[PDB]
């Protein structure tokens, strides 16, 4: 299972970590990754597991990795060594493509939609609170990103299983189709509305791509449908495994709870620091040449797995990483990345956070765990939360 040291590699720098099973992840998730940072651990080491990598550890290093990308290339940028979605593996271009996807996701856009967002959500919300209970991750995380996502791009609701249903196929096959078999399914629905919306465009954010411009020219089929695909994928399991580490540290903590309750204006800044200590994701990059990095020699080719989650964690960044602390004067973290490709969807992400935890907290200020329930997370380049079970009674709710 680990994979034979490169000769470049010295074995001081050796720490099998694996990404995708980590030791500790039954003590939570980010604790687990959050061992790389314990003092007998340098700022880089290489891991022997998922072929071979090197893992940057601390926020200064993941940040200037994440900068150079003259050095750390998207070309390969996820562990282990189909994937087309249009900018993540790609400057005049990549920078063209981020322009044109800020035009649609960017924070006018937000800003117009975010009342959409909210009537989503209590739509969503008052349809569980009557009930006493749910499965948070199933119920209103899974419907949620998804349903914003058919009002961002214009598309029918009727189109919403079948869509989720390729999307699930890309992170979680079932074993119905290969990856590559899910994303031309996902081409085949794209194509021909994009084609549509070419000649007869709306404002909607289908329209917008379908009709922007690349190298002075018009975008083609293929990338408007790569870029139309990253739209949708980017925003639907960071959304999902995020809202439920949220929720799985407010219904564990009735003073967090609490201070949102009595406070709301705190909420927008509760999000942010929600967002540095359940930051999930972590991708990578790939060495372009031979490089010396903070007196280690990388070899051009190796991979480097550089966690978002981690920078925040790291308590070079952070005083008590592990505290959840609403008031923190700066909260550092690169939750949503770092250097050009800086998530697009930030804006709409913070958005749908914010209004979660407002209209939630409203209508069902009080809940837990249910009672017996063990929360399992699970590792990988998104990190997540398998299952979460709530409960409330619902004559401390408040309907619509
Ligand atoms: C809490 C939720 C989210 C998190 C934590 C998150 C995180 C990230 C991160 C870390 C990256 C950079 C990856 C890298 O550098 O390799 C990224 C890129 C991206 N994200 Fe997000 N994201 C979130 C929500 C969204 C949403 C809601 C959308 C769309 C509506 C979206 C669309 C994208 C796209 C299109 C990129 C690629 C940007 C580029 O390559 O230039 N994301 N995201």
Redesign the pocket.
């Given at each position: 299972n680990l994979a034979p040291l490169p000769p470049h590699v010295p074995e001081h720098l050796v720490f099998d970590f694996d990404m995708y099973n980590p030791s500790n992840l039954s003590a939570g998730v980010q604790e687990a990754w959050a061992v790389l940072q314990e003092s007998n651990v340098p700022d880089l080491v290489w891991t022997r597991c998922n072929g071979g990598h090197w893992i940057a550890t601390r926020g200064q290093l993941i940040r200037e990795a994440?900068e150079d990308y003259r050095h750390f290339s998207?070309e390969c940028?996820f562990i282990p060594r189909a994937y087309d979605?249009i900018?993540?593996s790609?400057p005049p271009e990549?920078r063209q493509?981020?322009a044109l996807?800020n035009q649609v996701?960017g924070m006018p856009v937000v800003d117009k939609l975010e009342n959409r967002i909210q009537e989503l959500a209590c739509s969503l919300i008052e349809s569980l609170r009557p009930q006493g209970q749910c499965n948070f991750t199933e119920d209103y995380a899974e419907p949620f990103?998804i349903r914003?996502?058919m009002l961002?791009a214009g598309l029918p609701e009727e189109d919403i299983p079948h869509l989720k249903y390729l999307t699930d196929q890309m992170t979680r096959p079932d074993g119905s189709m290969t990856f590559a078999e899910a994303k031309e399914a996902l081409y085949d629905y794209l194509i021909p509305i994009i084609e549509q919306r070419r000649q007869k465009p709306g404002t909607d954010a289908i329209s917008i791509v379908a009709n922007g411009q690349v190298n002075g020219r018009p975008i083609t089929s293929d990338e408007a449908k790569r870029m139309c695909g990253?739209?949708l994928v980017?925003?639907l399991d960071?959304?999902v495994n995020?809202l439920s580490f949220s929720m799985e540290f407010l219904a564990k903590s009735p003073e967090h709870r609490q201070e949102l309750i009595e406070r709301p204006e705190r909420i927008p800044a509760a999000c942010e620091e929600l967002?540095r200590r359940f930051?999930?994701?972590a991708?990578?990059?790939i060495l372009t040449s031979d490089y010396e990095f903070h007196g280690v020699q990388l070899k051009k080719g190796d991979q480097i797995l550089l966690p978002?989650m981690l920078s925040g964690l790291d308590e070079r960044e952070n005083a008590a990483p592990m505290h959840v602390d609403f008031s923190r004067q700066k909260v550092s973290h690169?939750?949503?990345?770092?250097?050009?490709?800086?998530?697009?969807?930030?804006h709409?992400?913070r958005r749908?956070?914010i209004v979660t935890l407002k209209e939630w907290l409203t209508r069902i200020p009080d809940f837990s765990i249910a009672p017996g329930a063990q929360i399992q997370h699970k590792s990988g380049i998104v990190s997540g939360v398998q299952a979460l079970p709530l409960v409330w009674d619902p004559a401390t709710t408040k309907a619509v």
């Open positions: 994440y998207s940028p979605f900018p993540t790609m990549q493509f981020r996807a996701v990103p914003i996502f961002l990253l739209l980017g925003g960071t959304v995020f967002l930051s999930l994701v991708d990578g990059r978002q690169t939750t949503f990345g770092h250097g050009s490709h800086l998530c697009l969807g930030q709409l992400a749908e956070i």
